[PDB]
């Protein structure tokens, strides 16, 4: 149906905000979303859900949509018990030191799980960690790591979130020592088993090496490949062209620019990633609105396109990740 025609009389800021809010449910996103929801609905004995993909496909958008829909589903059940927390999600923190800092991650997980109804679990067995003089939780600096981890486990089992989201989980791979890499994931696994809460990890292809240090990790977890659109198969090309057509029809401009015929250039820059395409189109629309133009020309795309070196590096990384994910386990079942 396209964008509302009334927005043409609205200022440029409103049109840009509308374009930013608008989302596209392309078939790969829909498939990944359905798979993730079905995996969340039944743990099947898996304590981890790994969803890895190329940068700019929409992992963050998928997480956000999953969180919104899960909150919508849990609201009727939240009516009865206000203490239960439906979903907790928090981006992993890239450490400034070589070793990953689990203490800060635990503190930030506790802060994320903060509930305005603090009276339910005001005491986690803490040393003053509970909020005081302000809404936010004030974590005591001198609290040791094991005690604060115990407090996090107590809070998690008290709230019992349906699923725990760790955005950009590839920062877990950042460790000082090569042999020490084997410990962070098993520590997180032990935390998951002790809490019993379903942990979901999101990240890029950098975690693939971190993903399969052993077959036990594959056995005790569910893999979701957020596949990009590949120009090799005509079906993905058709899907990309249709996504371009939808963006063309939904972009708030007086004249709809024919972006379909330049699909080769878009794939050259976006590399089949929907999120990068959306960011590029938002930039182009911003320039169009600031110039108060009426149509989008190829110069507008070229001005804000990613550099050829950036595209080459991104393609090399994603191709290496895909080739590494082509690993096969051909053996006795």
């Amino acid at each position: 149906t396209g964008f509302p025609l009334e927005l043409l009389t609205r200022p440029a800021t409103e049109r840009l905000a509308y374009f930013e809010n608008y989302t596209v449910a392309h078939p790969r996103l829909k498939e990944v979303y359905e798979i993730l929801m079905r995996t969340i609905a039944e743990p099947a004995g898996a304590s981890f859900i790994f969803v890895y993909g190329a940068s700019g496909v929409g992992k963050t958008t998928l997480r956000l949509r999953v969180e919104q829909k899960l909150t919508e589903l849990a609201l009727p059940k939240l009516e009865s018990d206000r203490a239960r927390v439906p979903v907790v999600g928090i981006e992993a923190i890239a450490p400034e030191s070589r070793y990953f800092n689990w203490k800060e991650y635990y503190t930030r997980a506790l802060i994320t799980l903060e509930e305005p109804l603090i009276d339910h679990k005001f005491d986690y067995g803490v040393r003053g960690i509970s909020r005081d003089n302000f809404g936010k939780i004030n974590v005591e600096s001198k609290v040791v790591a094991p005690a604060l981890r115990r407090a996090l486990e107590n809070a998690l089992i008290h709230r019992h979130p349906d699923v725990f989201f760790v955005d950009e989980a590839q920062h877990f791979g950042k460790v000082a020592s090569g042999y020490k890499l084997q410990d962070q994931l098993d520590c997180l696994k032990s935390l998951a088993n002790m809490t019993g809460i379903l942990h979901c990890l999101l990240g890029t292809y950098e975690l693939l090496t971190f993903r399969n240090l052993s077959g036990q990790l594959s056995r005790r977890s569910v893999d979701i490949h957020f596949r990009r659109y590949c120009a090799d198969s005509p079906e993905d090309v058709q899907a990309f062209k249709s996504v371009l057509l939808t963006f063309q029809q939904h972009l708030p401009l007086a004249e709809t620019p024919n972006l379909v015929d330049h699909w080769e250039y878009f794939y050259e820059r976006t590399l089949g990633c929907i999120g990068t395409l959306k960011d590029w189109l938002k930039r182009v629309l911003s320039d169009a609105l600031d110039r108060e133009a009426t149509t989008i020309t190829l110069k507008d795309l070229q001005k804000r396109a990613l550099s050829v070196a950036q595209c080459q590096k991104m393609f090399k990384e994603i191709q290496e990740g895909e080739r590494q994910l082509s690993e096969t386990e051909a053996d006795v079942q």
Partner: peptide, 7 residues
Amino acid sequence: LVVYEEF
């Protein structure tokens, strides 16, 4: 070429 509903 199928229009996609908002995600």
